[PDB]
């Protein structure tokens, strides 16, 4: 199927109480492979999936250098933005950056992203053409123009089309036995009876990878109504994921509701009627 | 593999 590499950066200022806290993470699909935490011991980019460990010390020294340069730029950014928005030197603020490439089934470049956010709200973002910037805010107009004069987009475009996909492919090869392997959902139904008139049904999918799953309830030709309860997919802790999809039936008759489960791990979509 | 060329201060 399709794949991606994504890095996530977080910088939280710590007014008075030391230097900002900086956290960086890397993913291939829904598997983390690297991390950095400014408040751990190593002060090094650290491995997190087995197959990345295979890279030599040039890689570790390299990625440690760059990640720290990310951090340093964020550390400056927090001082910049505190100015832009007239905020006080006391009180915490947050910078977030995220970037990465997508490839299709043929392992070729589909799309790339580089977005940035200040105190949890969009700030500046590289458009999908990878030549243009989206800047809601006034302060982000300032940033837009500076980055435009700096040809930031031109550099990011390359990375995204080159380094980002090439190495995504290298990682998919090295972690082939796990990254390219699918774990199908183990599914089951359950029936919890709210009121003597009402019954709640939750459709379960367990032990699946990747995270991409769709769970559509039905009463023969029905979908989500402001009733369908579809919770966020969650980590099982072992590298697989879990998700459930509920529906309440004031029916004394749970029929004939169907749960429908779709995943790359199933050769055919599943249909699930209720039991006894 | 992280970005080596392309991160700028805002």
């Amino acid at each position, epitope marked *: 199927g399709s794949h991606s590499m994504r890095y996530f950066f977080t910088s939280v200022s710590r007014p008075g109480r030391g230097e900002p806290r900086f956290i960086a993470v890397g993913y291939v699909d829904d598997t983390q492979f690297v991390r950095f935490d400014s408040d751990a011991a190593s002060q090094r980019m650290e491995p997190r999936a087995p197959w990345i460990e295979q890279e030599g010390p040039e890689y570790w020294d390299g990625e440690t250098r760059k990640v720290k340069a990310h951090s340093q730029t964020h550390r400056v950014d927090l*001082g910049t933005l505190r100015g832009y928005y007239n905020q006080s030197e006391a009180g915490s603020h947050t910078v977030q950056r995220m970037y990465g490439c997508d490839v299709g089934s043929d392992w070729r470049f589909l799309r790339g992203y580089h977005q940035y956010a200040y105190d949890g709200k969009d700030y500046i973002a590289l458009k999908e053409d990878l030549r243009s910037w989206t800047a809601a805010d006034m302060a982000a107009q300032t940033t837009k123009h500076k980055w435009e004069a700096a040809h930031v987009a031109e550099q990011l475009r*390359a990375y995204l089309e080159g380094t980002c996909v090439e190495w995504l492919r290298r990682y998919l090869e090295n972690g082939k036995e796990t990254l390219q392997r699918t774990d199908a959902p183990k599914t089951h139904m359950t029936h919890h009876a709210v009121s003597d008139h009402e019954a709640t049904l939750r459709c379960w999918a367990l032990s699946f990878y990747p995270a991409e799953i769709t769970l559509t309830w039905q009463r023969d030709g029905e979908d989500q109504t402001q009733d369908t309860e579809l919770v966020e997919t969650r980590p099982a802790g072992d590298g697989t994921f879990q998700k459930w999809a509920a529906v309440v039936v004031p029916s004394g008759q749970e029929q004939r509701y169907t749960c429908h489960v779709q995943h790359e791990g199933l050769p055919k979509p599943l249909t699930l009627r209720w039991e006894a | 593999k992280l970005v080596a060329l*392309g991160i700028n201060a805002v």
Partner: T-cell receptor
Framework: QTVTQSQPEMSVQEAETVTLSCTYD???????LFWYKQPPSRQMILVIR??????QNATENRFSVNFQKAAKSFSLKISDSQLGDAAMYFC?????????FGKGTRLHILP | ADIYQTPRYLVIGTGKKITLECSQT?????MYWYQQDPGMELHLIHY???????EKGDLSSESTVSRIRTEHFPLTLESARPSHTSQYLC??????????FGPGTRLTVTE
């Protein structure tokens, strides 16, 4: 070092062509390369600038470069040498940080 | 508008303390301080990502400067020594691309 200019000195007749050599060592694919001129004023001036994702051409002036990524080679070609090309020439490697320079080549131009 | 270095020349005598002004009005974030011996090598001695940011490269004396009220990136050698004798090249950077060097300060420390 990381950027290597293995000829500290070079000399050429007027009106002739010279190729100042540069190689570098990087475990990175994205970066930028530079040539910088420093005549007796000691004022550093950009000569040419090559990003790692660019292709042929540019070039642009009486100075060209022969950039070869796999070779990690970033040669500077100076043709129709004038006496004003007498100067130090530096080759340089750059990332988000840093930029570091090779040791440099002092160029004499024989009239 | 441009990048500036003052003073152009300075003579001091060992043990004394000295500050080299480098200022630049081009809006640039990254700035750098290179030190150049009579043997001509360019040594990265300090740099900076933007205000509050400082980092070293090496070389005794000056090697930290400051960067707050604009950039404005002053080098300071506390207690100068004949070792400090050299050119001091300050430079500003467009983005993560080329550099723009000030004229330089020629510093001689005398016994």
């Amino acid at each position: 070092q990381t950027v290597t200019q293995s000829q500290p000195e070079m000399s050429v007749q007027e009106a002739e062509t010279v190729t100042l050599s540069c190689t570098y060592d990087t475990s990175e694919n994205d970066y930028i390369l530079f040539w910088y001129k420093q005549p007796p004023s000691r004022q550093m001036i950009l000569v040419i600038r090559q990003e790692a994702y660019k292709q042929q051409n540019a070039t642009e002036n009486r100075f060209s470069v022969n950039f070869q990524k796999a070779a990690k080679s970033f040669s500077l070609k100076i043709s129709d040498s004038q006496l004003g090309d007498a100067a130090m020439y530096f080759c340089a490697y750059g990332e988000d940080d840093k930029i570091i320079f090779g040791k440099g080549t002092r160029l004499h131009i024989l009239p | 508008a441009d990048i500036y270095q003052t003073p152009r020349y300075l003579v001091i005598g060992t043990g004394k303390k000295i500050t080299l002004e480098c200022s630049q009005t081009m809006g640039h974030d990254k700035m750098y301080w290179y030190q150049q011996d009579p043997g001509m090598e360019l040594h990265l001695i300090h740099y900076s990502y933007g205000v509050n940011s400082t980092e070293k490269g090496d070389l005794s004396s000056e090697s930290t400067v400051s960067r707050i009220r604009t950039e404005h990136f002053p080098l300071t050698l506390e207690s100068a020594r004949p070792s400090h004798t050299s050119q001091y090249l300050c430079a500003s950077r467009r983005g993560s691309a080329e550099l723009y060097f000030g004229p330089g300060t020629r510093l001689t420390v005398t016994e």
